[PDB]
């Protein structure tokens, strides 16, 4: 089986300065190699699932190694304590939202852990918990969710998005868009909440704010005929 040193060498060889620049622009810090996710497919196909190696890779603090650790993890064997370790190391949103939340969405304890995270009051843990719901609404049938719980979550986003921490706002906006398209029981309420919320401004260090517009984004998906569509998050 592939060892830690060999994976780290292969990932460093795939790093490109362009991809790296972008990751650093988004909040990654050294060490980081800048590996495009599709370039990971052959290494991931060799390894399949290996929790031990995922743990060593996540501990590097190297964003690309940490991303790859999520692809090779065994989330059905990870405990709540394991996910709390991983979220403690997720130092910016690409880790919280695209690595830990996606690994969590593939576990058997996703909603329980995401709910705790949403309740935590900590920017990136809450971002991971809202993000995990977006990934679950694309990889689960509707009957995996309580309609009243999702409705109460939409109301929480309406009532509190504009005074939430910046990265939390991005993930709650993603939740509005994802409920409107991928959770048809509350399609109409999500559309109306999006209209009530309006533009959501995500302030960012080192670049301009992002002005999100969930009403627009939902309308683009409706224009494409995607009401009801559920997309499993694509990792690589
Ligand atoms: Cl806002």
From TrEMBL:
Q: Where is the signal peptide?
A: none
CDD domains (alphabetical): AlkD_like
Q: Specify the protein name.
A: DNA alkylation repair protein
**Where is the organism placed in the taxonomic lineage, from the top?**
Bacteria, Bacillati, Bacillota, Bacilli, Bacillales
